[PDB]
Every structure is written in structure tokens, then in C-alpha cells.
């Protein structure tokens, strides 16, 4: 399915009730500095289950418009997502601030966070892995992360991490931690069996991503000389050590990885993001200023990949006309004068105009 629109009421700078969108398959959010783009990113994170600590406030009630200056505009606020799927009625997922705590709703019926998260997971929206959302200043870190932290992402998406506690227990019961481990019989077999279960879960995900990433890095790079390799440091127990990620940039000789430019790291990060999607598809990606370090050549290749894929919807926030003029529609954010920053939006269809001369 796809994200048809977002409805926001009195959330941070978005005073009153506002429709954001409707979205097309490739939509860009744009606007002058200070207009409220980052607050809109926060609203999307919020309705998709983000914890209050990651929303730049000390308490949930501070997300209500006007609260950071002692003048809250209401005793409630909400963000809602309308999710659409062919052959199905629209489904509305909402997070409402009432009484200083979150209330979750699906089609206006109240659900607990566990059920909200479970229903989002059935759509491909993983609110723990959060592989569908890239924040400003973060895209490069995806390609340059610690190998061990890359493993943790795969343990979360594959659910192999659900077995780590039993794995650790059986490993010690088998003698790990003794000077000379003496494993034999049932304790050793118990460990081998949970090791196999964790291995199988991990590799069901990892092998799929690792065997699809090269084509995607090529398809992004639009060049058969680019190469991408994903490999475990520990082939027998991939979940125990790091996941190595190395690339060869299109038409370039091999460089380590940290020696890549910001733009080259960005493309490597996107390749990994989209390779994960090839295994566990998300309905949409929200990409906040991922074009910051891209030159114009790479902006064109990234936009072309999105447009010749939109199996997913792309919602991007961009400061670069070279990128956002390749979207189907624009959501423009502007500020209104008031006691505090008020944000409002406009919508503009670019497909009405020739992209030519």
C-alpha cells in the first residue's frame, strides 16, 4: 500500500488541523529555513511510534502547539496517517495526545501500543527497526556504521535477536566461560540446536539482502563497474560479530570506505536501505535531506531509481531544487507570524509542466 495523506492537529508548529498531502508516489517537502520541515519529520516519526525522547521534548505535552512557551493551544493534539491499499478501504492510524499520554487508534478504535505496532508490522512498517526513515545528517552513518551495529539491525529485522538470550544461556550451560570448556551430550546439543535456529533466522534475511545489494548499488550507480559486498566477519555464526560492507564506486578504483566522499557514502547507504527493502518491503520511505552531500550526477541517479521504482513510495525533504524538481508533487511549508512559530503547507503538482526545453 501507500501513505495517502497525513492529518495533523496542533502538533509542534502545525497549529490547527491540517491535511499534509495527498502524496504522490514521489513527493518532496520543501520550504525556507525555519518554516517547520523538521517538525513535519517529527510528526511522521510520532505517528509511526517514535519515543518522546527522540522528538526534542522533555515531556509529551510539550508537543502540543504553544506548550514550549506556556501557552498550549489545546489539551490534545494528534497525528494521523491514512494508509491505502488496492482493493481495500483506507485504514487510519492515529496517535493522540490526551491527558499527557499517548492514545493509539486504528480506524478511530482505541488500541494498545502492542497492537498498533503489530498492525504496522503487517504492512512492512517496523517501528523498532525503523528502516523506512532516514533523518537529516544520518544517511552517511548507515554506510559507515560499526560492523557490530550493522549486525544488530539484521538481528532485529530477521528476529534472530529474539533467540540471543536463550543462545547465551545454553552457551554458558555447555561450558563457555570455563578454562577448558567440556561440552558433551545434551548441553552441547542444546546449544548447537539454538545456534542453528539463530543462524537460520539471521541468514534468511541476511543472505537475501547480501545477494540483492550488488545489483541495487549498480542500479543506483547506473554502472556495471560499481560493486557492493556484504559479508559476515564470522561466517559460521554471523550474528556474533560484525557485518562488513565494502563497495567499489562506479568507474573508480577501490578505496577502503571512510575515504569515500560524502556523496559516495550516501549512495552506499541508500543501496543498503533499498537492499533491506528487497527482502522486507516497506510501503514508503521518508528521506530527510539525503541529497545533502550528493552532486548533481548522483542526485539524478537517485531520483531516477526512485521514479523507476515508484515497489515503494518516496517522501523526501529537500533543500536542493536539482532533487525536488524531479518529484511529482511538492508540499511547500511556510511560516505564519504568531506568539510562536506556526507552520502551514501548500501543494503543487509538477507533472503539469514539461521537464524539458
Amino acid at each position: 500500500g501507500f501513505l495517502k495523506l497525513i492529518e495533523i492537529e496542533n502538533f509542534k508548529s502545525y497549529k490547527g488541523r491540517q491535511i499534509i498531502g495527498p502524496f504522490q508516489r514521489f513527493t518532496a517537502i520543501i520550504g525556507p529555513n525555519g518554516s517547520g520541515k523538521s517538525n513535519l519529520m517529527d510528526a511522521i516519526s510520532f505517528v509511526l511510534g517514535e519515543k518522546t525522547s527522540n522528538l526534542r521534548v522533555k515531556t509529551l505535552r510539550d508537543l502540543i502547539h504553544g506548550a514550549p512557551v506556556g501557552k498550549p493551544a489545546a489539551n490534545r493534539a494528534f497525528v494521523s496517517m491514512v494508509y491505502s491499499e488496492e482493493g481495500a478501504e483506507d485504514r487510519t492510524f492515529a496517535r493522540v495526545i490526551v491527558g499527557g499520554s499517548s492514545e493509539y487508534k486504528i480506524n478511530n478504535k482505541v488500541v494498545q501500543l502492542h497492537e498498533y505496532s503489530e498492525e504496522l508490522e503487517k504492512l512492512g512498517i517496523l517501528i523498532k527497526a525503523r528502516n523506512f526513515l532516514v533523518f537529516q545528517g544520518a544517511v552517511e552513518s548507515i554506510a559507515m556504521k560499526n560492523p557490530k551495529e550493522r549486525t544488530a539491525l539484521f538481528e532485529e529485522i530477521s528476529r534472530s535477536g529474539e533467540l540471543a538470550q536463550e543462545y547465551d544461556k545454553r552457551k554458558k550451560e555447555m561450558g563457555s566461560g570455563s578454562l577448558v570448556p567440556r561440552g558433551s551430550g545434551s548441553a552441547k546439543q542444546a546449544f548447537e540446536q539454538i545456534k542453528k535456529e539463530r543462524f537460520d533466522r539471521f541468514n534468511a534475511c541476511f543472505e537475501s539482502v547480501a545477494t540483492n545489494i550488488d545489483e541495487i548499488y549498480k542500479a543506483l550507480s547506473r554502472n556495471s563497474s560499481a560493486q557492493a559486498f556484504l559479508g559476515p566477519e564470522n561466517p559460521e555464526e554471523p550474528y556474533l560479530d560484525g557485518i562488513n560492507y565494502n563497495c567499489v564506486a562506479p568507474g573508480k578504483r577501490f578505496r577502503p570506505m571512510d575515504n569515500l566522499s560524502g556523496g559516495e557514502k550516501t549512495v552506499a547507504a541508500l543501496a543498503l536501505l533499498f537492499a533491506i527493502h528487497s527482502y522486507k518491503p516497506a510501503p514508503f520511505f521518508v528521506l530527510d535531506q539525503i541529497d545533502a552531500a550528493l552532486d548533481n550526477t548522483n542526485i539524478g541517479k537517485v531520483a531516477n531509481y526512485i521514479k523507476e521504482q515508484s515497489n515503494f513510495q518516496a517522501i523526501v525533504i529537500s533543500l536542493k531544487e536539482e532533487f525536488y524538481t524531479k518529484a511529482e508533487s511538492l508540499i511547500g511549508v511556510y511560516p505564519e507570524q504568531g506568539d510562536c512559530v506556526i507552520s502551514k503547507v501548500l501543494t503543487f503538482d509538477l507533472t503539469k509542466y514539461p521537464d524539458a526545453n
Binding site: 491535511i19 498531502g21 495527498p22 520543501i30 520550504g31 525556507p32 525555519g34 518554516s35 531544487e321 525536488y324 524538481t325 508533487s329 511538492l330 511547500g332 511549508v333 511556510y334 511560516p335 507570524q337 501548500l346 501543494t347 503543487f348 503538482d349 509538477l350 503539469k352 509542466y353 514539461p354 521537464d355 524539458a356 526545453n357
Partner: protein, 57 residues
Amino acid sequence: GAESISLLELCRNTNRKQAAAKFYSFLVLKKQQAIELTQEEPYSDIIATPGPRFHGS
């Protein structure tokens, strides 16, 4: 000058990059309070009228 400016009229016979730049300029002018903006429905025309601050050109 006129009482109002239609963004869709301004963008007639423009290409995509030119149209996007006119849309972005409306956002900047609104931030500067050089114009007021109305849009009746999502994706309808966007109409500018004079704002409460003077502005050149």
C-alpha cells in the same frame, strides 16, 4: 499592479524547474510577509495578495 496573483497563471508555459522556482518564491515571500497566500483545496490554484510588509519588485 493587480489585486491578486495566480500561481498557476504565472506558471503557464513554464517548464518544471521554472514552475517549482515560482512556487518556492511564494513560500519565501510569505515568510517575508510580502504576500498573503490562499489555497482553496490541496492542489488547487494558489493566490497571492499583498502582505503586511512592503517588498521591492
